[PDB]
Scaffold this active site. Sequence first.
Site, short mmCIF file in Angstrom:
data_model
loop_
_atom_site.label_atom_id
_atom_site.label_comp_id
_atom_site.label_asym_id
_atom_site.label_seq_id
_atom_site.Cartn_x
_atom_site.Cartn_y
_atom_site.Cartn_z
N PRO A 178 59.92 19.81 38.01
CA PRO A 178 58.95 18.96 38.75
C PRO A 178 59.03 19.06 40.27
CG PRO A 178 59.72 17.79 36.83
CD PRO A 178 60.46 19.10 36.83
N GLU A 216 57.22 40.53 39.61
CA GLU A 216 56.15 39.75 39.00
C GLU A 216 54.89 39.84 39.85
OE1 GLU A 216 56.75 36.22 36.41
OE2 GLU A 216 56.03 35.15 38.21
N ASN A 250 61.55 32.79 30.79
CA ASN A 250 62.07 32.53 32.13
C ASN A 250 62.00 31.05 32.48
OD1 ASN A 250 63.22 33.27 34.67
ND2 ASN A 250 61.21 33.08 35.64
N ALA A 251 63.06 30.53 33.09
CA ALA A 251 63.19 29.10 33.38
C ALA A 251 63.86 28.89 34.74
CB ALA A 251 63.98 28.40 32.29
N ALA A 252 63.04 28.62 35.76
CA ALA A 252 63.54 28.24 37.07
C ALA A 252 62.70 27.15 37.72
CB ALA A 252 63.60 29.46 38.01
N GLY A 311 24.74 33.98 33.69
CA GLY A 311 23.86 32.83 33.57
C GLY A 311 24.21 31.95 32.39
N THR A 360 57.41 29.92 30.19
CA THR A 360 56.60 30.95 29.54
C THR A 360 57.40 31.63 28.44
OG1 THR A 360 55.25 31.39 31.52
CG2 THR A 360 55.43 33.15 29.84
N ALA A 407 61.49 21.15 41.61
CA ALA A 407 62.23 22.39 41.80
C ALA A 407 61.45 23.63 41.39
CB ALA A 407 63.55 22.34 41.04
N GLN A 465 18.05 42.50 43.51
CA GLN A 465 19.11 42.65 44.50
C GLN A 465 20.17 41.56 44.44
OE1 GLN A 465 17.56 43.38 48.43
NE2 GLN A 465 16.84 45.46 47.94
#
Lengths: 375, 375, 382, 382
Positions: free
Chosen positions: A130, A237, A125-127, A334, A160, A132, A274
């Site tokens: 920088p 999504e 997916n590409a939409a 820890g 992605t 936009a 506790q």
Amino acid sequence: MDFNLSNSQSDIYESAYRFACDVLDQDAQTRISQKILSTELWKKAAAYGFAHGPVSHQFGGSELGALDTALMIEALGKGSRDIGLSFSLCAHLCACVIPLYRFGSSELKDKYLESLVTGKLIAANAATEPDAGSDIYNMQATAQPCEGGYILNGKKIFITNAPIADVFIIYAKTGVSAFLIEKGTPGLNVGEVIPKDCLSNCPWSEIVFNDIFIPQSQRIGMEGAGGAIFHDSMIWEKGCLSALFVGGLARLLETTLEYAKARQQFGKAIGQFQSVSNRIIDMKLRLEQCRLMLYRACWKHDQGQDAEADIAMSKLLISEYAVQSGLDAIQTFGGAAMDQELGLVRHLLNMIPSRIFSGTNDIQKEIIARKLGLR
Amino acid sequence: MDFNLSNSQSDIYESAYRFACDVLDQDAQTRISQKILSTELWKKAAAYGFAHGPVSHQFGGSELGALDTALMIEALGKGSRDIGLSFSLCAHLCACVIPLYRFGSSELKDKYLESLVTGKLIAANAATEPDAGSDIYNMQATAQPCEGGYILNGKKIFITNAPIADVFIIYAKTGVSAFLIEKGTPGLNVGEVIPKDCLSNCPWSEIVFNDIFIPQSQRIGMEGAGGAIFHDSMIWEKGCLSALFVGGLARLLETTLEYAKARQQFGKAIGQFQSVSNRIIDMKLRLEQCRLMLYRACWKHDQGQDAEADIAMSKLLISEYAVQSGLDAIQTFGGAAMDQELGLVRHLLNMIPSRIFSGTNDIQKEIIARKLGLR
Amino acid sequence: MDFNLSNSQSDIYESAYRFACDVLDQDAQTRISQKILSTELWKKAAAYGFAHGPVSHQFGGSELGALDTALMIEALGKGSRDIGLSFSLCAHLCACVIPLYRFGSSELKDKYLESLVTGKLIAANAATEPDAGSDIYNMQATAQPCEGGYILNGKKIFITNAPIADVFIIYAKTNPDHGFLGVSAFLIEKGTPGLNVGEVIPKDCLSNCPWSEIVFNDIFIPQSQRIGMEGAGGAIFHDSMIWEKGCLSALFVGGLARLLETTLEYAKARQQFGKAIGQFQSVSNRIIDMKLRLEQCRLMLYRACWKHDQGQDAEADIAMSKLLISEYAVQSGLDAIQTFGGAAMDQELGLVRHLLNMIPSRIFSGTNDIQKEIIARKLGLR
Amino acid sequence: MDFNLSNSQSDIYESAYRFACDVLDQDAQTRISQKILSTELWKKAAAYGFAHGPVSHQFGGSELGALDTALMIEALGKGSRDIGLSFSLCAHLCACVIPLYRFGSSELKDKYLESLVTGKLIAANAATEPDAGSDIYNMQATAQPCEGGYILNGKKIFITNAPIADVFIIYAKTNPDHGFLGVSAFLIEKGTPGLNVGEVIPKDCLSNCPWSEIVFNDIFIPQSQRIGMEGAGGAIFHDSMIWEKGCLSALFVGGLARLLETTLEYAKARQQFGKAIGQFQSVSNRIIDMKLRLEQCRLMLYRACWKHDQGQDAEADIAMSKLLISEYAVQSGLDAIQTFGGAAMDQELGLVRHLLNMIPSRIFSGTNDIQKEIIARKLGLR
């Protein structure tokens, strides 16, 4: 009012959980440490059903509803530590499979859909750009019309699945429109990977369009329609990632419970102290609440009601609770928490892009406020 | 009651801040991206004074007090993005330089101290093991007595600075005792690095002792004294790391302030939107409060008062506030936060080991409760 | 940097704490039960010094600075349970004595200031109205100029100390134009014609602290009873609230200190499961939170006060102090109810009423949003 | 999975909300001001169905399930401001009607149950003492067996509805041995010799809800007035509190719903800076929090109630509901004071008294630590 899974829903959840446990999680430790995205397991998972969503049987889907899909992805988030693979799957499903199934022509569907649904083809997916990435109306990606198609030019970043992708769904200015583009088409240049940590083994990179000719038939939906199509994507999504994190939260709780019932200090399991016990109670409270919010949003949608504010509430709650509980878990383990084999610090790493994908939390607050009558 | 820095303290703070800005921060971006710990800059910083602490002029120190040291390390945390280098420095100072100066013989001091203080020798700390990291009384590291010395055997893991270290401070069962050991001594085997993310470019690895002969004079303090010596270390460490994070918090605030005064959306700087503005106000509230708590702990110590509960309160507050504000900053930047060049996600990565080093928060709560009369 | 009290400050604090413990607190239990505001004890406390603040010795003050005053009022908040008496005192000091000392003419000060400072006259503050409580620029109170003075008309509500007050500091319109310069401050005596003070409406949030509404029906204000120059009221008022913000913060810091000590005692003694319940990490975590809050906001308040004493601009620091103390006092009061359980609604134990009295902290000189706006502006966010 | 009300549940909720709005709320303002508990309205509401719960039709009940009851009490909490009347009703239902219906003999039920269910007799609950309020196993209340009955002696304190009560459900020792089996439950009529009910001590946290202390001085309890078998009291009591926990949670869920709607209205209308103040992200963020809290804990409560109606074990789910609702109600009440500012202490607006009445949620059937312990145990942490 009923709070049990129907037998069908339990079947969907339990089969998916078995698949995630027995197939995907088996060597997840190793692939994760080595930052490996296994296309083999990816396609096994896609063909199993994780790439189907609501797509009809005619295209190899199972005609699932929203609550059904959420249950599959919840099992996936609980059963498999390989969360980067899970994210790649969700993106392929929500950003490409679902838009093509709901808005594409029968020609586009017949050419591409069943291959995407059954996992023969991986999609990216590409939409985002920088300036936009947020405002997906002002975009430095343009598809000018020409004879029998378009000429596409621009640069999309943070894509992605692009390093592994066979097809790309591109949003471009014309109005915005949506196009499916095959990998390798001349002038399409996929770039190399910049190292990743937040969902590390999920590949992403940037693509460059340099005078790409898009056939007329590769447009998804009508001209100018991109903004609606995209909007639909993000909803799905929002839901799927919500499901995924609910599942991870469930995993995180059981793990912490184990560590608390076993770890013996001062002559008793440290869960009788506790501090750790209060953190576990918090985890349980968070998980049950946002689980119910998520199911109700999905179920409202399946009823034909408008669920968009309910899903905004869900995403808000799960984003917050997942981060907080990840902190609580680091505090509970820890000095055993930075165990890369235990994978908790990387769990929170992968949970970081929750407020960095389908809306920051302020966007959800705006949706809810508008639904309440506050603007 | 007075809330201004004395002229001497302002001088210490401003000189250190100039050094961190002009020398260490210059190419920090690059060294960080390339996971480089520059021994060159490390030694420049050590010789400047960051390795001195309270060590007297006789050994090349500046005879600083606790508040003075905290002011140096605060400037360091504010002025330099290279926080992994800063952490290496603090560890060298608190775990090796300060124990040697306070508990070592004049022979050990004359042989090693001034070289450590002036940065000719880098030191690493080793007292943590799989079951002996927390309980530093039950430890699978043993130094049996022998003619004119000891035979050391064991395996210490997660040793900060071991890949670059010239000497090691080892805690071993005898009672526990403290030994200085030179790199290369036969049977001492330093191991290779496992990849790091939480203070990434700060080197750590595991060392193996296989029948190491320790000369008698390389023991620090009396036999059995290790536990007190170590205890002293952790106090100083607690303080220095607190200072470092206060400084980083200051940096984080100014950065966020910039992004808020410049970023224009809806016709106004996004800092006029009460979500981002409320997160910045939170950052400011947190920073001022825990800054004051830290100065008062340090100042009480410099008065000869017992400051251990005050420093426990400081570490608790700064741990919590640093994590929370890092979250707030990720939320404020949105999709520009995962900019590796902006270095925020890595900032929080480096802040993760705050509750994973000199006590989880439960240990501090125990110190405070004991000081209050609650057990 | 120094975190010790000077000997002078230590004496001021210890003397005030003894006075609060031994004089004001002694029968506080009963006066609280019967909703009694003791004008006797009010006047003793004022004459002791709680009505003095920065007033010079020539008017009966002690020339305390802001930090000194804050230490006194902290002692008062810690040592005396009669928090309504404490609030009445703070109001008289911050809303009346201090504006008069700082902005009043030598004639006005010579007539009134020593009587206010020594507690022979109680003063009340009147700037709040239904829509004009917040914007004390948009006001349904008007004092139009006239021959040798002004004619005042209006209605002020929620007036702390009005049932017991001998004089009132009134804010009124005098230049209905725009600009931040159309309100002025006047001192008006009780009984002056056209002034009708009202009866008390039941109270719970600082119950025994008297308040009511006053109505001005063509009251003639002599010219000499204006405080400061014309239009200066808006500045005067602003200054008042700053001092009020600090003093109330001190009072609540003191109450938090009291609440912590009580909670510590109840925790070291109360034995359940065979041990003092303070060893149960729930109660101890609540106490540790109380201690962390108390120390943090205590230091924020001292530093704001100290900054003011240096001549530095302290407005954002005081806003931060008020913000932190409001929040922490509410939270610690809740934690205290949680720790006491079914003994918290003990009217003689006074915890539920303690939190009730802590309620108007975000209901007097700014909600928390006002403080956030002061801080945001000081930070450059508008 | 289904998130709609069935038509039956929808009717139960809407009918109860109409009754609360049109009958109980109509003059709630005044009764609240004058601390009046209307026995008239109490009896109307009980006979309408708020005293019925799961009681079968043969005793005048409606055979509601837990979810049905919770929907009724939610409607009550949303539609009527007279929260003390609501709390008095919930106490009568959960602490008296339900133990008698579930554990009492046919003789006892035949004598008393329909009168309680229809509101001809008001009942009060008595199991709390100075040290025995919490551990209702260590009790300074003793009912020793004797010829044809028991002799009861002791003193029970903080008794909801005791000044107005016609009967009392008493928990008493009968086997001073160990084991969780030494307390039994008895029904005792008002006026029986040796029972001395006390006068009212001033209240603020659910002010108009009457409470006092009763003292037993050699009261003879007929044998037939024991509820359940001997020693069963501890189970009986436990069951009571579960039902109480659910109903009070419903009540507060309802109040939160009311508080949200009010806050929404005040936000859409109040114009400041030229726009409704709900466009200011402070007030809107507070409203969004209220909505998030309301929906989350609403669903947690419905699911606990539904689980109980399935026969599943609901104790940890009900503990989670009570925990969440206590916390959220306190927080949202604070946020509401913060949003109203100086109009929040409006006694007719009733917000400060609203939070006052929400105070005893963590002061009745468990503090929050008890709920955490139930959950931790159910999770396997002890």
